Amino acid sequence: AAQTNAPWGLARISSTSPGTSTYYYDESAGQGSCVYVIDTGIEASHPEFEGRAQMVKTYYYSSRDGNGHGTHCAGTVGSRTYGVAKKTQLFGVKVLDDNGSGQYSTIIAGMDFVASDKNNRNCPKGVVASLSLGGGYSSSVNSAAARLQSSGVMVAVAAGNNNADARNYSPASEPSVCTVGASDRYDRRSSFSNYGSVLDIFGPGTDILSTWIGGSTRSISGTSMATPHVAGLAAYLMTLGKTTAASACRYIADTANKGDLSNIPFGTVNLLAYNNYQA
């Protein structure tokens, strides 16, 4: 399948070169997979989600996304126009309040929630969790991400936006999950992207168009935007049967575009997520 005039990041993930604008992908499109977006919520009524999104859990007075961040991330995972995996099922877990903040204890509870809740959902092709959040190093936060991964969920986490070594941030620094840095449309490391040996992969993160609350759209930047590209890619590849939740991060790194990004610090992987789809 070909989506013309796609957001640059979608085009990038199906291309061996920057500077194109069509996204190419197998029509299975993540059908039969599920992606949990652990964030500020998801505006599931957005036409872009086509009934495939739902809120399953909140720790606050509403499950609605009063911020937009979670809706944007969910759109990059799986919206019809802005999403990598256009037929996946999206499940929202609201661990962040409408200001975008959340206590680590709530975030940990949300991760353990997903590890159990997947047993209440139909995801024959596999389960992914996208975590566009983080703060300073916490062994308990890292351990929660490790448990979620161990339970059979492909965990993708943002590296962070500090232009610093991600070893000092959580859950970015957890070795067993997929830690995602951000790149721009010219294949440069995004100016804010964290780096370091703990990163597994880069995805598009600068000037990413996606869904927003109020049935709208907007372009924003962050490792929060790169992470759902990788989460959606994992769901897409699991639906194709090419990899599993336990092996998808390594498979994405195996099959990435290699050595094409600029301003990658010595010791950080130079790997850009790529679907290897041959139309």
Side-chain angles (χ1 to χ4, degrees), residues 1-26 28-86 88-257 259-279:
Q3 176 190 353
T4 57
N5 299 106
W8 79 262
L10 299 190
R12 191 69 194 83
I13 65 151
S14 61
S15 185
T16 54
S17 283
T20 69
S21 65
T22 307
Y23 176 37
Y24 307 109
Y25 63 94
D26 188 277
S28 60
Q31 192 138 63
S33 70
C34 303
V35 185
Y36 286 81
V37 181
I38 305 175
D39 213 287
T40 64
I42 307 174
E43 188 175 275
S45 62
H46 200 301
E48 277 281 317
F49 295 123
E50 313 179 295
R52 290 178 291 101
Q54 43 183 309
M55 290 303 302
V56 300
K57 181 60 175 187
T58 181
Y59 298 88
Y60 306 91
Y61 51 83
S62 179
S63 71
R64 291 177 217 101
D65 182 9
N67 183 277
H69 183 269
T71 293
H72 195 276
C73 293
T76 297
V77 176
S79 67
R80 65 191 184 185
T81 305
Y82 310 98
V84 173
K86 298 177 187 299
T88 194
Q89 288 285 318
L90 299 162
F91 300 134
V93 179
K94 180 172 174 61
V95 300
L96 303 181
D97 69 19
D98 284 344
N99 299 317
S101 307
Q103 294 300 291
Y104 269 169
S105 58
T106 301
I107 292 160
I108 289 168
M111 285 193 262
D112 286 318
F113 172 87
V114 175
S116 180
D117 183 74
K118 71 182 190 293
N119 299 131
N120 287 322
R121 312 296 167 191
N122 285 298
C123 312
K125 297 306 189 180
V127 185
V128 182
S130 196
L131 284 67
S132 291
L133 54 73
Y137 180 85
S138 159
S139 65
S140 290
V141 171
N142 282 12
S143 177
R147 288 193 296 278
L148 181 55
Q149 177 70 52
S150 165
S151 84
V153 177
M154 191 285 183
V155 179
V157 311
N161 304 326
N162 323 93
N163 188 35
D165 195 311
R167 75 195 309 168
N168 282 320
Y169 300 90
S170 289
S173 61
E174 166 52 38
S176 71
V177 302
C178 211
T179 301
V180 184
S183 66
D184 76 13
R185 73 173 72 244
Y186 302 108
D187 284 351
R188 305 179 293 210
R189 181 169 68 88
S190 302
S191 57
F192 49 80
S193 184
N194 284 351
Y195 52 82
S197 62
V198 75
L199 268 68
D200 299 280
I201 193 68
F202 283 80
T206 299
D207 298 334
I208 305 304
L209 180 57
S210 191
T211 41
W212 200 252
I213 54 170
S216 69
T217 61
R218 67 178 59 185
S219 172
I220 56 164
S221 299
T223 62
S224 287
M225 292 50 267
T227 302
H229 280 91
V230 172
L233 177 59
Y236 165 89
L237 295 168
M238 298 158 57
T239 287
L240 284 174
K242 302 191 163 283
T243 191
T244 70
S247 53
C249 189
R250 188 175 301 203
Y251 179 85
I252 287 166
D254 285 352
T255 60
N257 281 310
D260 295 323
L261 296 173
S262 62
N263 201 34
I264 300 295
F266 197 83
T268 296
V269 296
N270 195 328
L271 298 172
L272 180 63
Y274 173 51
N275 74 359
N276 203 24
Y277 178 66
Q278 306 314 332

Coordinates of all heavy atoms in Angstrom, one line a residue, residues 25 35-36 63 94 96 102 117 119 146 164 181 203 211-212 222 278:
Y25 N 3.7 0.4 2.9 CA 3.5 -0.5 3.9 C 2.6 -1.7 3.5 O 1.7 -1.5 2.7 CB 3.0 0.1 5.2 CG 1.6 0.7 5.0 CD1 0.5 -0.1 5.3 CD2 1.4 1.9 4.5 CE1 -0.8 0.4 5.2 CE2 0.1 2.4 4.3 CZ -1.0 1.6 4.6 OH -2.3 2.1 4.4
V35 N -1.7 -1.9 20.7 CA -0.7 -1.0 21.3 C -1.4 -0.2 22.4 O -2.4 0.5 22.2 CB -0.2 -0.1 20.2 CG1 1.0 0.8 20.9 CG2 0.3 -0.8 19.0
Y36 N -0.8 -0.3 23.6 CA -1.1 0.5 24.7 C -0.3 1.8 24.7 O 0.9 1.8 24.5 CB -0.8 -0.2 26.0 CG -1.7 -1.4 26.4 CD1 -1.6 -2.6 25.8 CD2 -2.8 -1.2 27.3 CE1 -2.4 -3.7 26.2 CE2 -3.6 -2.2 27.6 CZ -3.4 -3.5 27.1 OH -4.2 -4.5 27.4
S63 N -10.9 9.8 32.2 CA -10.1 9.1 31.2 C -9.8 10.0 30.0 O -9.0 9.6 29.1 CB -10.6 7.8 30.9 OG -11.8 7.9 30.1
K94 N -4.2 6.3 31.2 CA -3.9 7.6 31.6 C -3.2 7.7 32.9 O -3.8 7.6 34.0 CB -5.2 8.5 31.6 CG -5.0 9.9 32.0 CD -6.3 10.8 31.8 CE -6.1 12.2 32.3 NZ -5.1 13.0 31.6
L96 N -0.7 10.1 33.2 CA -0.3 11.5 33.3 C -1.6 12.4 33.3 O -2.5 12.2 32.7 CB 0.5 11.9 32.0 CG 1.7 11.1 31.7 CD1 2.4 11.6 30.5 CD2 2.7 11.1 32.9
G102 N 3.0 13.2 36.0 CA 2.5 12.1 36.8 C 3.5 11.5 37.8 O 4.8 11.6 37.5
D117 N -3.6 -6.5 32.0 CA -4.7 -6.2 31.2 C -4.7 -6.8 29.8 O -5.7 -7.0 29.2 CB -4.9 -4.7 31.1 CG -6.2 -4.3 30.3 OD1 -7.3 -4.5 30.9 OD2 -6.1 -3.9 29.2
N119 N -4.2 -9.7 29.1 CA -4.9 -10.9 29.1 C -6.4 -10.8 29.1 O -7.1 -11.8 29.0 CB -4.5 -11.6 30.4 CG -3.0 -11.9 30.5 OD1 -2.4 -11.7 31.4 ND2 -2.5 -12.5 29.4
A146 N 10.8 -3.3 32.9 CA 11.4 -4.6 32.7 C 10.3 -5.7 32.9 O 10.3 -6.7 32.1 CB 12.6 -4.9 33.6
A164 N 21.2 14.9 26.5 CA 22.1 14.3 27.5 C 22.1 12.8 27.4 O 21.3 12.2 26.6 CB 21.6 14.8 28.9
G181 N 15.6 7.3 20.5 CA 16.0 8.7 20.2 C 15.2 9.3 19.0 O 14.5 8.6 18.3
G203 N 13.9 7.2 15.8 CA 12.8 7.4 14.9 C 12.5 8.9 14.7 O 13.1 9.8 15.4
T211 N -2.6 13.6 15.3 CA -3.9 14.0 15.9 C -3.7 14.8 17.2 O -2.7 14.7 17.9 CB -4.7 12.7 16.3 OG1 -3.8 11.7 16.8 CG2 -5.3 12.1 15.0
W212 N -4.7 15.6 17.5 CA -4.8 16.4 18.7 C -6.2 16.4 19.2 O -7.1 16.1 18.5 CB -4.3 17.8 18.5 CG -3.8 18.6 19.7 CD1 -4.5 19.6 20.3 CD2 -2.6 18.4 20.4 NE1 -3.7 20.0 21.4 CE2 -2.6 19.3 21.5 CE3 -1.5 17.5 20.2 CZ2 -1.5 19.4 22.4 CZ3 -0.5 17.6 21.1 CH2 -0.5 18.5 22.2
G222 N 9.6 15.9 19.7 CA 10.1 15.3 20.9 C 10.5 13.9 20.7 O 10.1 13.2 19.7
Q278 N 9.0 -3.9 0.7 CA 9.2 -3.9 -0.7 C 7.9 -4.0 -1.4 O 7.3 -5.1 -1.4 CB 10.2 -5.0 -1.1 CG 11.5 -5.0 -0.3 CD 12.1 -3.6 -0.1 OE1 12.0 -2.8 -1.0 NE2 12.8 -3.4 1.0

